[PDB]
Design a protein around this ligand. Structure first.
Ligand SMILES: *[C@@H]1O[C@H](CO[C@@H]2O[C@@H](C)[C@@H](O)[C@@H](O)[C@@H]2O)[C@@H](O[C@@H]2O[C@H](CO)[C@@H](O[C@@H]3O[C@H](CO[C@H]4O[C@H](CO)[C@@H](O)[C@H](O)[C@@H]4O)[C@@H](O)[C@H](O[C@H]4O[C@H](CO)[C@@H](O)[C@H](O)[C@@H]4O)[C@@H]3O)[C@H](O)[C@H]2NC(C)=O)[C@H](O)[C@H]1NC(C)=O
Ligand SMILES: *[C@@H]1O[C@H](CO)[C@@H](O[C@@H]2O[C@H](CO)[C@@H](O)[C@H](O)[C@H]2NC(C)=O)[C@H](O)[C@H]1NC(C)=O
Ligand SMILES: *[C@@H]1O[C@H](CO)[C@@H](O[C@@H]2O[C@H](CO)[C@@H](O)[C@H](O)[C@H]2NC(C)=O)[C@H](O)[C@H]1NC(C)=O
Ligand SMILES: *[C@@H]1O[C@H](CO)[C@@H](O[C@@H]2O[C@H](CO)[C@@H](O)[C@H](O)[C@H]2NC(C)=O)[C@H](O)[C@H]1NC(C)=O
Ligand SMILES: *[C@@H]1O[C@H](CO)[C@@H](O[C@@H]2O[C@H](CO)[C@@H](O)[C@H](O)[C@H]2NC(C)=O)[C@H](O)[C@H]1NC(C)=O
Ligand SMILES: *[C@@H]1O[C@H](CO)[C@@H](O)[C@H](O)[C@H]1NC(C)=O
Ligand SMILES: *[C@@H]1O[C@H](CO)[C@@H](O)[C@H](O)[C@H]1NC(C)=O
Ligand SMILES: *[C@@H]1O[C@H](CO)[C@@H](O)[C@H](O)[C@H]1NC(C)=O
Lengths: 215, 48, 74, 226, 49
């Protein structure tokens, strides 16, 4: 999970909606609601800061070239689909596996879902063409068959393991991605964590609403 | 209640306000008529 | 001079076609700022777009560097 | 050059700090939030909470104990509820600082006392080393980072054939300036003639994708001929 | 959530923008790379190990 639903609550109308006689009595309780309304505001801003830090780690929005000659590596399921919201295939499944007049409003997030997908296109665009370098400085295009041979060099595996096994590893990685789709496609229990965040928040508000019925 | 700048000063309890977006009040349409309805009975009640 | 945004009905701001960095967040990717003067609202920039000249036989290797000093506060 | 770059780099920190008061927003927020907390806490004493007056002495002067105890109770449950909120606010806020300190305690442990290899842990770029500096209620780091600057395109190939054997760079990657083939380290263009001491042999040409023909120099042959 | 975000922010920092050497930080095994994929109110990684 990254961000909560940016809930916002109005103190007075939740408590004394459309009532002068009730709002006055609330005023004798001093700054209680100005505190509450402040705290939820503090949460609300932090949520956009959360999303800002998680995704917006890269300065320039990169784009992959039309050439997909990645030495056999097939990303087409994780790169954005130009033919749709420019979201990747695997992204869509994720969106699809996940699911009032009393002052309980929701503020929309600063970075919208289409906006996010641009970042996650860049981070993927820098990752495939440029390697790690686009984080430390100027993004340097690297042939992808090269880049693995650095990553294998990064876990104590000599370069020549990759190229002598380039074809197999490609198929394994390509096949690897596919099973993710089936795993994601088959079960909605894969996304329990994110679902849990929404359900708790839904319950919290749901509980919050019901208290209006109590004597 | 002078203008939306004055509202922000009143809420922030200050005469100076920084850059940003401030939640200050709540738009509410006011009622324009008064409707009073009861079933038409004409029988004076026999408390007597 | 009224702009309709996904977050609501924005009054007082000119809508602008250009993109800039976010100065005041509004919602729905709309960010406002005070510029020459009036209050403008626009679709916030994600930064300058930068394609990369990827290919299967090209390498981009720095020939000079910098030492920078970054302040980070906790 | 590296000396001058670091010295000048230090200087700009002064100006950014000297001019921009908002460079220290984080610490200022900590004080401001607490200052807000206390002031709100203080102000509640003025609230009536339904009591006939918010001045505790006033009630006792005006009312006999049989009735004042009711009014006093009203103030008590209110103000006590106010401390409850304030104390609770502190605890959560304390933990937020607590993670910050531990993170700070971390950053001085890896980044200061050593050279972290976690990218973006020690400021943008490959990390070199850092300095702490004290500050009100917090610490400030001056991460010294290595960021490459000027690039040149080159044509590459993951291996080269000398006698039909595949050669690979022991450390670095192959490049060419168009007519001659060069191996260079990864983050600073520094060519060297490709020789047996630079590269190790593995397999043969018929498997590698993108391997290209070249000539690998042998240091030993000239010694033998001479 | 806030702590998870930093862990996420950390993960995309070391594990996407680089190759982390912290065992069991980018999934079981010797880490290679990872790709983020967006998600409602969260992020999803595909650690290639
Ligand atoms: C219980 O009994 C009370 C006693 O009344 C008797 O018993 C009941 C059962 C009835 O049968 C009643 O008719 C009996 O007389 C009873 O108190 C009575 O309540 C009625 C209704 O509220 C009163 O009638 C009112 O009359 C005045 C007239 O006032 C002028 O005359 C009187 C005479 O004494 C002067 O004192 C005044 O100064 C005035 O000069 C009306 O003004 C009034 O308002 C409207 O009525 C007339 C038409 O009736 C309209 O034209 C006006 O414009 C007003 O719109 C009442 O009509 C009656 O006076 C009163 N009795 C006494 C002795 O005061 C009670 O209501 C019964 N029920 C209960 C308690 O539930
Ligand atoms: C990458 O994989 C995708 C699917 O995993 C490939 O798209 C398939 O292409 C074949 C034609 O060869 C079609 O019959 C399928 O219906 C396509 N599937 C989908 C989901 O679109 C794509 O061709 C692969 N690309 C490379 C370069 O290997
Ligand atoms: C690497 O870059 C640095 C600056 O980033 C260059 O240093 C400058 O060189 C010029 C020569 O044209 C001098 O006039 C400047 O005074 C130097 N700057 C500093 C701060 O000393 C350096 O020449 C570059 N080196 C290479 C090989 O490109
Ligand atoms: C690529 O680099 C090589 C350096 O090895 C260049 O070759 C040298 O060029 C100089 C300039 O006249 C000559 O004096 C040397 O004798 C050359 N060396 C050899 C071994 O022939 C070459 O010119 C460069 N080419 C390009 C296109 O950059
Ligand atoms: C590197 O040079 C060798 C020659 O030593 C090339 O080998 C030739 O390969 C072609 C293609 O199969 C054959 O038709 C020739 O008969 C080979 N030459 C000889 C002398 O037998 C090899 O192709 C070169 N490699 C590259 C990548 O160009
Ligand atoms: C942007 O340009 C289009 C013309 O392509 C125009 O229709 C639209 O009104 C412009 N919007 C603004 C805010 O200038
Ligand atoms: C390498 O070539 C591409 C081709 O478009 C160009 O955009 C890029 O600036 C070149 N790199 C350098 C360092 O000149
Ligand atoms: C790169 O791709 C081109 C096709 O545009 C192909 O002719 C060439 O052989 C490829 N080279 C390598 C090293 O993959």
């Amino acid at each position: 999970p990254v961000s909560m639903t940016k809930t916002s609550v109005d103190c007075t109308m939740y408590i004394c909606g459309d009532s002068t006689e009730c709002s006055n009595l609330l005023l004798q309780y001093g700054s209680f609601c100005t505190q509450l309304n402040r705290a939820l505001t503090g949460i609300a801003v932090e949520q956009d800061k959360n999303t800002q830090e998680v995704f917006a780690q890269v300065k320039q929005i990169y784009k992959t070239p039309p050439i997909k000659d990645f030495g056999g590596f097939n990303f087409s399921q994780i790169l954005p689909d130009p033919s749709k919201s420019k979201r990747s295939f695997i992204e869509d499944l994720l969106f699809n596996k996940v699911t009032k007049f009393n002052g309980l409003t929701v503020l929309p997030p600063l970075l919208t879902d289409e906006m996010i997908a641009q970042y996650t296109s860049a981070l993927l665009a820098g990752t495939i063409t440029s390697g790690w370098t686009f984080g430390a400085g100027a993004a340097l295009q690297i042939p992808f068959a090269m880049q693995m041979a650095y990553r294998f060099n990064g876990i104590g595996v000599t370069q020549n393991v990759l190229y002598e096994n380039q074809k197999l590893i490609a198929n394994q990685f390509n096949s690897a991605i596919g099973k993710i789709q089936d795993s994601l496609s088959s079960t909605a229990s894969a996304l329990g964590k994110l679902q849990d965040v929404v359900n708790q928040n839904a319950q919290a508000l749901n509980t919050l609403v019901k208290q209006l019925s109590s004597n | 209640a002078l203008d939306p700048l004055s509202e922000t000063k009143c809420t922030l309890k200050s005469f100076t306000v920084e850059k940003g977006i401030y939640q200050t009040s709540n738009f509410r349409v006011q009622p324009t008529e008064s409707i009073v309805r009861f079933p038409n009975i004409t029988n004076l009640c026999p408390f007597g | 001079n009224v702009f309709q945004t996904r977050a609501g009905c924005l009054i007082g701001a000119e809508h602008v076609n250009n993109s800039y960095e976010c100065d005041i967040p509004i919602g729905a990717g709309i960010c406002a700022s005070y510029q020459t003067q009036s209050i403008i609202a626009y679709t916030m920039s994600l930064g300058a777009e930068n394609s990369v000249a990827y290919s299967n036989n090209s390498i981009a290797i720095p020939t000079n560097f910098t030492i920078s000093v970054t302040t980070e506060i906790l | 050059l590296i000396a001058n770059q670091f010295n000048s780099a230090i200087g700009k920190i002064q100006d950014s700090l000297s001019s921009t008061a908002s460079a220290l927003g984080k610490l200022q927020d900590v004080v401001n939030q607490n200052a807000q907390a206390l002031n709100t806490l203080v102000k509640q004493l003025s609230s009536n909470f339904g009591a006939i007056s918010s001045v505790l002495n006033d009630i006792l002067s005006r009312l006999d104990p049989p009735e004042a105890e009711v009014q006093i109770d009203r103030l008590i449950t209110g103000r006590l509820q106010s401390l409850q909120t304030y104390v609770t606010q502190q605890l959560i806020r304390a933990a937020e600082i607590r993670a910050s300190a531990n993170l700070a305690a971390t950053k001085m442990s890896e980044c200061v006392l050593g050279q972290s290899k976690r990218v973006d842990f020690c400021g943008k770029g490959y990390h070199l080393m850092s300095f702490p500096q004290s500050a009100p209620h917090g610490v400030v780091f001056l991460h010294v980072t290595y960021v490459p600057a000027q690039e040149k395109n080159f044509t590459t190939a993951p291996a080269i054939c000398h006698d039909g054997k595949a050669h690979f760079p022991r450390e670095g990657v192959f490049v060419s300036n168009g007519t001659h083939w060069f191996v260079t380290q990864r983050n600073f263009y520094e060519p060297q003639i490709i020789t047996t001491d630079n590269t190790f042999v593995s397999g043969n040409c018929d498997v590698v994708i993108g391997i290209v023909n070249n000539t690998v120099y042998d240091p030993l042959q000239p010694e033998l001929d001479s």
